[PDB]
Structure 1
Amino acid sequence: HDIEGLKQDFRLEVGDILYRDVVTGDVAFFNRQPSLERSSIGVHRIVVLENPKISTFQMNVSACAWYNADFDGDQMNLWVPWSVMSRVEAELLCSVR
């Protein structure tokens, strides 16, 4: 069901699946190609930038050592886990710590 075509419900029914927006504090897999080391894909806590004019993936400069990255024009992938099973394992196994 859509959310714009469905506005007659006071609350939700138990068992439903809600596809909510990504918020600050969510974990995300963050990758740069080529992936040579196994630290090339790491899990970071998302900080959502409220500025509508920002279109870049910002990270601390000390975090570039994981990905062998720099800011001369590199592009990096990012996918946010949504499944509970994949979201658990991102926090416990794939965290950049």
Structure 2
Amino acid sequence: YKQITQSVHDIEGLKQDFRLEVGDILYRDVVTGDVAFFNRQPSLERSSIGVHRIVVLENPKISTFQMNVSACAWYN
């Protein structure tokens, strides 16, 4: 999101920008260490929504949300 144009720009059209300007907004991929809200319905407890640090699984054949079995008590 370029501030000078006040509009969103595709990354494939910005091949000539070299760097980024101050005030620009970059929509980057989710990386390991990012925080995420984990929720299981029905949301009945105060812990039914919790924030976990993201561990990105680079195996392309994994499509599941993996979690420690001891974290399941928060969400039942």
Answer yes or no: same fold by TM over 0.5. Answer: yes
Per-residue deviation, residues 20-63 of structure 1 (Å, max 9, x unmatched):
00000000000000000010000000000000000000000000
Distance 1:18 1:61 in 2: 35
Q: CA RMSD in A?
A: 2.0
Q: Distance in 1 between matches of 2:10 and 2:74?
A: 40
State the TM-score, normalized to the length of structure 1: 0.68
Structure 2 length as normaliser, TM-score? 0.87
> 2 CA distance for matches of 1:52 and 1:4?
24
Structure 1 gaps, min length 5: 68-96
**Whose strand fraction is larger, Structure 1's or Structure 2's?**
1
User: How many equivalent pairs are there?
Assistant: 68
**Structure 1 moving runs of 4+ over 3 Å:** none
Structure with higher RCO (Cα < 8 A, 6+ apart)? 1
Unpaired runs of 5+ in structure 2? Answer: 1-8
**How far apart in 1 are the matches of 2:22 and 2:44?**
44
